[PDB]
Structure 1
């Protein structure tokens, strides 16, 4: 069946759309080639519609059926809880899209009578009606990139009331079921340090390792109605409250398998028969589907001792080599099996024999040295997108600060320490905003974090070595330096100079600012300050940070104030 059908109505914006990076003094201090930075808009939506619309042909076999039964036997151990309305309301981001029914995210979070009444009505409707397709809005996503232009990605999501109900029925399922089913292969249970440890230990565990990343083209569009019903068959193995069982059944038939598309103007846009990108099950469902197809494809390909690491549609496989020619042929057999399963490749996978050459979750393993000269493995990535987005976020107030998420997740990297920390601490200190909480995203969930709490966050995630790495690889240094020339970012010497300045100012303030000066900027001086465990680090409640993926799932993970 076609992933989408269209009526001809356009994918419309709801307000004015900015596509060019503004010429602003603060962003220009970071990145001077402003014309290279752009944001996607609804103006390119028709190009994306063409790419995501195609017929799916899916052929299932015994390997697929065998793996599915194995997955369901593991799902059968799970007991999932129905969330109360209050619990589901607290998981709603403060800036989540308002309902079309007269209330918004602040009303949901405040448990306003109108919001609660409407959520109760939507819940009862899911329990009573098993078939009426649920309306969804389709919008073009506004995302920033560096040239060499991508068309806008499309986001499809139901109304706020339905999103609260999805949490009630499925938040516990999507949070706990993936690790129960996939075990160590489930990527979202790992912090970046745990992920690098898992990749390095897996790589070194093979007698002669071979690894590859597998890029499915337009994954959400490749997801069939059969895949979404198979995903529900796994959720149904949980012990569930009867209302949760009916809600999951109704949500599957009325929303997850497909439904009508409406634009921002209220016009009928078309019909979807594939994965919606903006529902609570997007991450979990994609992860399960990708794991199932890949596990079965490994068996069809006769790949030896496969270890998968899956995050949604992002897949990396590490296995035992059977020799270069045999590996090349088995990888072609894997691709053929994935294609039969309706997961054809974007670019053909390539066998890799060096762990540092593999890109998974847009990241690669690299090596640096700690204060003792000991080798420390860590995850890095090409810094082009992070820098382009940091420049955008400097010129415009954006709802999500990718720069803050990048400092947290890529804290050990040369580029996050020398450029992102220096730039934003310099600006925030000048604005007396170091203690102002900002929103960022970790594995798709929204968190409100104060920049002054970064040292203890980084220590907990990455260890104290994140503040002592030096002797970065020549390849990594070259990639960063080349990116700076390309984007017109000042060279690393300028960053060191700016860091010494903000470091002095932070130290002069005492308190949490001085802890930022000491730990975050010790790299900038020859006269190193002594770095001991931060007392606040052991007290941090990082429950919920690295449990599951929630991208597109409308999840907020910071504390709700009492009432």
Structure 2
């Protein structure tokens, strides 16, 4: 069937749309080539509609059915809990899209009678009605990139009331089931250092390793009605409260398999018969679907000792080499099996015989050295998008601060330390906002974090070595330097000068700022201060940080205040 059908009504914005990086003194201090930085808008939505609209041909076989039964037997061990209305309201982000039913995210979080009554009515409607398609809003996503222009991504989501109900029925399932089914292959259970460790250990565990990333073109559009029902069949293996079982059955048929599309103006926009990007099960379902197809495809291809690492549609495979000609043919057989499963490739996959040449979750393993000169593996990425987005966020107040999430997730990198930390600490110190909590995203879930708490967060996610790395690989240094020239970012010597300046001001303030000066900026001085384990690090409650993926699932993971 067709992934989408369209009526001709346009994908519309609900406010004015900015596409150009503003000319601002603070953002200009970071990046001078402002014309290279753009934000996607609804103006390019029709180009995306063309790309994501196609017919799906899916043919399942014995390997697919065998893997499914193996996944279902593991899913059978799960006991999932129904969330109370209050527990589900607390998982809602403070700036989540308001309901069209007279209330917003703040009313949900405060447990307002109007919010609570509506949610209860939405819940009882899911229990009673197993068929009526649930309305969704289709919007063009506003995302920042560097030129060489990508058309806007399309986001599809139901009303706030429905989103709270999804949490009640499925939050516990989507948080616990993926690891029970996929074990060590489920990427979202790993902190950055655990992911690098898993990748390095799997690579080294093979006699002669061969690895590859597999890029599925428009993954969400390739997801069929059968895939979505297969996904529910795995959910159905859980021990469930009867209402959770009914809500999952009703959500599958009324929302997950497809439904009508409405624009911001309230016009009938079209019909969806594929994955919605903005529902609770997108990350979980995409991971299960990708793992299922890839595991079955590996058996059909005759790839030897396949270890998958899956995060939604992002897939990496590390196996035992059978020889170069054999590996090349087995990879072509893997692609042919994935294509039959309705997962054709975007960029054709290529076998890799070096771990550092593989990009997975837009990241590659690199090596640096700690204070002792000992080799440390860490994950890095091309810094182009992080720097373009950090520049956008310096010029405009955004609900999500990708710069903060990038400092957290990429703390050991030369670019997060020298540029990102330097730039934002300079600005926040000058604005007396170092201790002001900001929202950022980790594996799609939102968190409220004070930049002054960064040293202890970093120590837990990466180890103390994140504050001591030096002698970065020449390939890594060159990619960073070339990106800076391309974007018109000041050279690293300027960043070292700015870091020495902010470090001195941070030390002068004492308290948490002096801790930031000591740990975050020790790289900027010859006279190194002593770096010991931070007392706050061991006390940090990082439960829920590296459990599951929640991209598009409208999940807020910071603590709720009492009432």
TM interval, short-chain normalised: over 0.9
Q: Deviations over 1:73-96 (max 9, x none)?
A: 000000000000000000000000
Give SS of 2:121's match. helix
Matches of 2:12 and 2:532, distance apart in 1: 54
Cα distance in 2 for partners of 1:96, 1:540 equals 26
In 1, the alpha carbon distance for the partners of 2:314 and 2:510 equals: 43
CA drift at 1:226: 0.1
Separation of aligned partners in 2, 1:182 and 1:354: 25
Cα drift, residue 286 of structure 1: 0.1
Q: Could you list the per-position Cα deviations for residues 137-161 of structure 1 after superposition, in whole angstroms to 9, with x for gaps in the alignment? A: 0000000000000000000000000
Alpha-carbon distance in structure 2 between the residues aligned to 1:432 and 1:104: 31
For 1:312 and 1:192, the matched residues in 2 are separated by 17
1:210 Cα deviation from its structure 2 partner: 0.2
SS in structure 1 of the partner of residue 504 of structure 2: helix
Whole-angstrom CA distance in 2 between matches of 1:460 and 1:221: 37
CA positional deviation for 1:514: 0.1
Structure 2 portions without partners, runs of 5+: none
SS of the residue 2:368 aligns to: strand
Q: How far off its partner does 1:416 sit? A: 0.1
1:215-254 pair list within 5 angstroms: 215-254=215-254
CA-CA distance at 1:185 after TM superposition: 0.1
What is the deviation of 1:500?
0.1
Instruction: Return the offset for 1:308.
Output: 0.1
- For 1:441, what is the secondary structure of its paired residue? strand
Number of residue equivalences: 563
Q: Deviation string for 1:398-418 (max 9, x for gaps)?
A: 000000000000000000000
Deviations 1:425-475 (A, max 9, x none): 000000000000000000000000000000000001101000000000000
TM-score normalized by the length of structure 1: 1.00
Q: In structure 1, what is the Cα distance between the partners aligned to 2:301 and 2:291?
A: 15
Partner of 1:459: 459
| Alignment partners' CA distance in 1, 2:59 and 2:532 | 57
Q: Cα deviation per residue 1:343-387 (whole Å; 9 max; x = unaligned)?
A: 000010000000000000000000000000000000000000000
Q: Cα offset for 1:52?
A: 0.1
Distance 2:560 2:298 in 1: 44
Q: Please say if 1:506 is aligned against 2:516.
A: no
Check if 1:66 corresponds to 2:66: yes
Deviations 1:198-232 (A, max 9, x none): 00000000000000000000000000000000000
Cα distance, 1:71 vs structure 2: 0.1
Give me the whole-angstrom Cα distance separating, in 2, the residues matched to 1:450 and 1:218. 36
Report deviation, 1:101.
Answer: 0.3
Q: How far apart, CA to CA, are the structure 2 residues paired with 1:201 and 1:287?
A: 22
1:32-86 Cα distance to aligned partner (Å, 9 max, x none): 0000000000000000000000000000000000000000000000000000000
Work out the CA distance in 2 between the residues paired with 1:70 and 1:355: 29
Quick one: distance in 2 between partners of 1:333 and 1:374? 41
Hey, what's the Cα distance between the residues in 2 that align with 1:347 and 1:247? 38
Partner of 2:425 in structure 1? 425
Match of 2:15? 15
Deviation sequence 1:81-117 (CA, Å, 0-9, x none): 0000000000000000000000000000000000000
Shift of 1:290: 0.0
- Measure the CA separation in 1 of the matches of 2:535 and 2:65: 51
2:55 alignment partner, SS class: coil
**Corresponding position of 1:325:** 325
Please state whether the residue corresponding to 2:373 is helix, strand or coil. Answer: coil
Give me the CA root mean square deviation.
0.2
| Partner in structure 1 of residue 115 of structure 2 | 115
SS at 1:376 equivalent: strand
In 1, the alpha carbon distance for the partners of 2:192 and 2:538 equals 18
* 2:101 equivalent to 1:80: no
Question: 1: CA distance between counterparts of 2:149 and 2:283?
Answer: 26
Distance 1:395 1:320 in 2: 49
Compute the displacement of 1:476 (Å).
0.1
1:521-544: CA deviation from partner (whole Å, max 9, x where unpaired): 000000000000000000000000
Match of 1:390 in 2: 390
Per-residue CA shift, 1:269-306, capped at 9, x if unaligned? 00000000000000000000000000000000000000
